[PDB]
Design a protein around this ligand. Structure first.
Ligand SMILES: O=C(O)CSc1nc(-c2cccc(Cl)c2)no1
Ligand SMILES: O=C(O)CSc1nc(-c2cccc(Cl)c2)no1
Ligand SMILES: O=C(O)CSc1nc(-c2cccc(Cl)c2)no1
Ligand SMILES: O=C(O)CSc1nc(-c2cccc(Cl)c2)no1
Ligand SMILES: *Cc1c(COP(=O)(O)O)cnc(C)c1O
Ligand SMILES: *Cc1c(COP(=O)(O)O)cnc(C)c1O
Ligand SMILES: *Cc1c(COP(=O)(O)O)cnc(C)c1O
Ligand SMILES: *Cc1c(COP(=O)(O)O)cnc(C)c1O
Lengths: 396, 396, 396, 396
């Protein structure tokens, strides 16, 4: 992007702005364009554009000046060729799939997945006769195996994973896949372009739910995919059809958020780590999950490919369903709700939060224990948080 | 909704507000809630909600207080059981399809369709093995015929149609379809809930591109579908997965726009008509399409089911591609761009605007002549507009 | 503004937009610029601007692209040289005063004034030793008299007046004033640039509280002053100091509202009149105030300078404090609150709404009877409204 | 505010939210209420409110739910009784003055002031016969002296000062003044409630231009005053008249900005210091101003009352007008413009930026040398900035 800029933070701030905006203004910030369409001065021009001789979005669903900024911004961060922005991560992933995976095609994905993302694959994709294989994030064998058994079109997974933050050796996987012509799409939502550059690692496509960290204010939804033009475009097209365009105001909000991405991520990364150990050492804490700890299975991989470990920490409390609840109920700072990555801390009991619809047995089918607890450390002051968590345990 | 509010206008203004908002405030307008998620006071409550004992959107993608208002508002207008709001009409229709039409199923639709909507049906649905039949809007025979030949899941079409505003005898069609268990979905975009109540006519589902008239300010994209709960919900579900949620700010803008829906539509309906005749009578005007005129094929139907004829008028100029262009180029008030229904007037040459990608021959395959011109009369003053149009004709 | 546009409405729509925006974009609507300041490419340029060789706002308090639009727009409507936009009408009038009236200066104003505006004059201006004389809106003699007795710096008043919508023969007054070198500033809030052009009538400065009609959505506050550059600028300066700048988002909302100004005003003007008569004819209605009726004192003047009579109507109910309340309490459509001019109808009992702080006696000092009722007819359907009003008159 | 919240950071995040909002919502963020007024359910209620038995804003100019949050938020940080929010700092200071200083009264203020603030005092206040005395920030004698000579009504000054960041020993001054019944109002804009609590130091009123740090995104204007109720309210009253209300959307943006106040300030404080020293040590750098350095006059006081030194740094370059310019022109990261405190870095040459209107001579009357350069360090990465600055020097 720029030469005088080298740190991500500086980028996340001026990427796609400091230099130019294609919207010319003596204003420091990016202006919010609220238009439903774009006009032409004269037919001759309209022809030029349609003949690919001029530049324009044509329709709001085909783009927006305020948006392209955020688009380019992210692109620079992830260090990609191009980026696309949906109305929400779900949209992103969802589309991307229907976009790249052909009919009757096959796809590979890890067991640990985002509840919703799971369903789509287990209920929608089959309609298009698209079959998929579920393997463990670590089980490289299975991947290599399946890679040979069937003709995989694309391997899709997020790393860190959810809710056990299991990580995948991108570099390695990308290799094994690219060997068989498969595509590698990683959902580094939990990671953040700052904590890892899946693309540089070899991945083909990387996508995040800006709804979480990128926006980090819990006041907007948005999804995004970044990667080589040749690929991303293909999606953009289908996107223009499914029409899941992201509103400018939303885009701005995100751009504004990314102004302090590094600052936040940094703080979150810390609080997470420290609290993690503190939690791991705590007696009432049965188990704790966090790539930062050595106790974590892929910890070594985490170190080898990440420079941080996010601000999300999962852990099982030494108690039962009711008891665990009593714990969260004790907390006074974090909000009890889904989502994560915002300035405000959040906690939840997956078992209930998003798996209560299942049976105590089927729940275990995924490792979701009435014990497990997810904690998205906000940006509040460590001590204030720690104290809260601790005091919260002294209630059982 | 209310017992003291009968006129649609009054409704479009206070529907889902005047009484209550479920967001309690001494404010006149609906408050814009910019949240990515919703929290719970205590686990006990989260359980209640999950157990369907409490009310909450859970996640921003599953709803929003600012949105439900607009949702209820529209619901009242169309006099439906419930309404859903997407990020754009395209999304709406696109989803609604994948939602109701099963795999390998069959769907019937008219020849005159929105370019994009067409493609989706001709390139995506086939993937799910979904076959469809294209018939003329008037050709009731074909419908009844196909209604028997194959097993139609749903008949989808807009009325007025585009760009020839061909209308469909809803009532009749609804009957013929419901007789064979097929579903009838009408895209009353061009119409507007004020000019026609497709639902009352018998239709099962009605959807508009709020991007156009509902918003009527050319500053926001949004789609919406309304109808019986039992049905709309099924879609809402799939919606929650594809994640094409509409941003609050957008929702508000629309709510703000509908405050003057009637006012606008009225003005637009008139200007259209008058200008239509005036245009029809003009020597340089070869042909003019508008349900308001008798010259219109389904004019009788238009009168029987409509109370207005929108503010959109299409017509062929007595000239050639280049000449016609010279005409639009002469206009000084309307903007040359797609979209329509906004306060500002808009014009375009379909042949170029959205079919230039096709051959002179293939173009005619749909009646799209280098002659045809679409005119979305804005809300500007009649005389001002008429004078402009006329002056732009002598040029030829 | 432009040649082809001659109807106020068309102007309120394309004024300062259709042609150019100085913010260049292929967008239909005006982009919202959210910046706190403006930069320069190089010192040489900064010098140029500072030396008045380049164009720029310099600081957000010194202007904004998104705002200048609304600025010019209004300017066109009122057919003025230049317009200024404050954060609220109050700011406007308030500033304008301290801006034009010198220390120890004198000013003339009518008895019927906006509560607040009054106080400022009766409590702040005195601090600067500024004395003022209060006269009856009609009593031209007093004005002419005072015009001679002391040396008036400026005659300030609003027409129609509040809450008796008393009007002032601008043209005449302007004459008498300009003869003695005095300045005439009219607050045509209740009027609207569409119902009258005080400027053309001879007035020096006209100002409205965009909070009411211009925005007419009851979702934003804003004031504006329009008139000759030589004058307006002098205010703008002091403005740049007191720093009461209007936020861009607000500006936009207004610009968006004015898109349907005419449409609204029209509807409002009608409903008002009709209802007015109907009300006047009603038995339980003791008296009715509206320039549209002949019963109105300055009705002739109203006809001579106005083309409409607003959508505001005041009237005394045949009852006592408690009874009158019971009436408003019966209404089901209008909201009980201050303000007015929005799509939503509003009602209030001045005696209480903004005079309850005064004694039953002191109240009468201004004609404010526990009887009087102000009714800002919204944009709802007439029948719906009338029916409501009537039905509430049977409860007494 | 809240027990479990001690670190300011945590407060700036949950102050006036985490607990309650008086706007009840299961939403994480504060909803943006866009209303111009507030209604009442029935007259009886209206009476109650007017009789001070109920709670309501009555009019939008009299408050707003979305605003009060930010109000309470700041209140908590500054640890005050109450806070008020204007449309801009200028508005704040401006109003505050006319609000507290009586007619013919006297006020004391330091020489180093905000250009605009200066004029207001030197051109407007005199109208109200308000005389003022200018003294050096450090010269305690003068203050004490003047404190006795005349009857001071209030001592107003900002610390750090501009553009030399001179600081004032609040505690001391507050003492000297309170001894003579004078009021102490400090403009800790440059400081930030995080780097100092003037209120705790004894000051009576503290105010900042949220336009700068509080918002820290260079995309919104707003001013705010905080202090004892008995005092602030007196201002709020006059404010309700002058009507300089802050728009909700503005308020929100700030609220959203403060979510990462600490995070930012922290980063800024560091970059500033480091760079300062590095600058001071640089040969081409004649002088450097920063309370963090020992070279600074009031450095000791800075240490005794501050915990930070802001992210603003002033310094004189070893060159002449033209040369200095050549320097800023070399910089590639910071934007050349007024304002400061935003994520983006800013630079300027006061001599030109806001004093070019004066003579080379009159300029020195305030120390403004064609040498001096102001640098508002953004939040970009240190190395990136440093590298830029340095490189911008070897260019001489
Ligand atoms: O249960 C699921 O898999 C999807 S629902 C979901 N909850 C959270 C979540 C909620 C609170 C804290 C943290 Cl770290 C995560 N993220 O997705
Ligand atoms: O070609 C298509 O149908 C898709 S692009 C499109 N243009 C318009 C359109 C443009 C101007 C006026 C009118 Cl009435 C309609 N509507 O959709
Ligand atoms: O009482 C005053 O003068 C100031 S408060 C005020 N209320 C209204 C008002 C309120 C409802 C309807 C109508 Cl038409 C006007 N206008 O100013
Ligand atoms: O010059 C004045 O007094 C008013 S204009 C002004 N510019 C800056 C300013 C500009 C750039 C950087 C820094 Cl630290 C400050 N601060 O006030
Ligand atoms: C939270 C999350 C999503 C959801 O994104 P939305 O924008 O809210 O739809 C998708 N994927 C992962 C891996 C997540 O953690
Ligand atoms: C304009 C239009 C669409 C497009 O809706 P978007 O929200 O702009 O995607 C779809 N259908 C009809 C019938 C239209 O007229
Ligand atoms: C309503 C009104 C005002 C108030 O304007 P704001 O923008 O709401 O402060 C001022 N003057 C008159 C004459 C009014 O009628
Ligand atoms: C920057 C600044 C202001 C300006 O505030 P606005 O909100 O931009 O009007 C006022 N006072 C001081 C001391 C400042 O440094």
């Amino acid at each position: 992007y720029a030469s005088f800029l080298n740190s991500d933070g500086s980028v996340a701030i001026h990427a796609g702005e400091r230099l130019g905006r294609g919207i010319v203004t003596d204003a420091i910030t990016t202006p919010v364009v609220n238009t439903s369409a774009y006009f032409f001065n004269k037919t001759s021009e309209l022809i030029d554009f349609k003949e690919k001789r001029r530049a324009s979005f044509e329709y709001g669903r085909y783009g927006n000046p305020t948006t392209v900024v955020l688009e380019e911004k992210i692109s620079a961060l992830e260090g990609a060729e191009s980026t696309l922005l949906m109305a929400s991560g779900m949209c992103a992933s969802t589309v991307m799939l229907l976009a790249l995976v052909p009919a009757g095609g096959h796809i590979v994905t890890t067991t640990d997945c985002y509840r919703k993302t799971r369903i789509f694959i287990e209920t929608i994709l089959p309609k298009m006769g698209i079959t998929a294989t579920v393997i463990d994030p670590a089980d490289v064998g299975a991947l290599e195996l399946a890679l040979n058994q069937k003709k995989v079109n694309l391997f899709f997974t997020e790393s860190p994973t959810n809710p056990f933050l299991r990580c995948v050796d991108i570099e390695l996987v990308s290799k094994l896949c690219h060997e068989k012509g498969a595509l590698v799409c990683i959902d580094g939502t939990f990671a953040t372009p700052l904590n890892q550059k899946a693309l540089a690692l070899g991945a083909d496509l990387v996508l995040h739910s800006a709804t979480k960290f990128l926006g980090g204010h819990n006041d907007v939804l948005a999804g995004c995919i970044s990667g080589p033009l040749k690929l991303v475009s293909e999606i953009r097209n289908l996107h223009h059809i499914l029409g899941g365009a992201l509103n400018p105001n939303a885009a701005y909000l995100i751009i504004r958020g990314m102004k302090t991405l590094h600052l936040r991520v940094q703080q979150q990364n810390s609080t997470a780590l420290r609290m993690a150990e503190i939690l791991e050492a705590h007696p009432k804490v049965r188990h704790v999950y966090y790539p930062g700890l050595q106790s974590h299975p892929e910890h070594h991989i985490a170190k080898k490919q990440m420079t941080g470990f996010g601000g999300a920490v999962s852990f099982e409390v030494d108690g039962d369903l009711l008891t665990t609840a009593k714990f969260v109920d004790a907390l006074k700072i974090p909000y009890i709700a889904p989502s994560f990555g915002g300035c405000e801390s959040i906690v939840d009991q997956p078992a209930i939060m998003s798996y209560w619809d299942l049976s105590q047995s089927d729940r275990a089918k995924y490792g979701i224990m009435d014990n497990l607890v997810r904690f998205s450390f906000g940006v509040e002051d460590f001590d204030d948080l720690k104290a809260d968590i601790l005091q919260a345990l002294d209630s059982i």
